[PDB]
């Protein structure tokens, strides 16, 4: 009697890494699997993101396909976003390396 799940989920498009520049809008699609619909959770530079937010925008289609959006990319948006998800049949991680380059200047001197 094998002690094991089969059904674990994984990742079928691996975070694509995207290079632009500051003020840049930027997408990161990613397809999650395993079953049921396993939570996500989207971690910045050591941080924690909110679905309701306005900076980015998170949509998962039908199928189960998360997709995270911003209007506006900033140097500090920069970092490693690693997204985690939970199931009740494995758990996996993964993370994505971005590149923000500083094409425009606040608008306060500094």
Excluded at 24 to 47: E, H, L, Q, S
Excluded at 77 to 85: K, P, V
């Amino acid at each position: 009697g094998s002690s094991g799940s089969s059904g674990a989920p994984f990742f079928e498009m691996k975070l694509k890494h995207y290079k632009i520049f500051e003020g840049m809008p930027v997408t990161f699609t990613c397809r999650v699997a395993g079953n049921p619909k396993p939570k996500i959770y989207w971690f910045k530079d050591g941080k924690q993101i909110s679905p309701k937010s306005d900076h980015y925008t998170i949509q998962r289609d039908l199928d189960g396909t998360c997709s995270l959006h911003t209007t506006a990319s900033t140097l500090d948006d920069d970092g490693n976003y690693t997204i985690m998800a939970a199931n009740p049949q494995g758990r996996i991680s993964c993370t994505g390396r971005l590149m923000v380059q500083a094409v425009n200047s606040g608008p306060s001197s500094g």
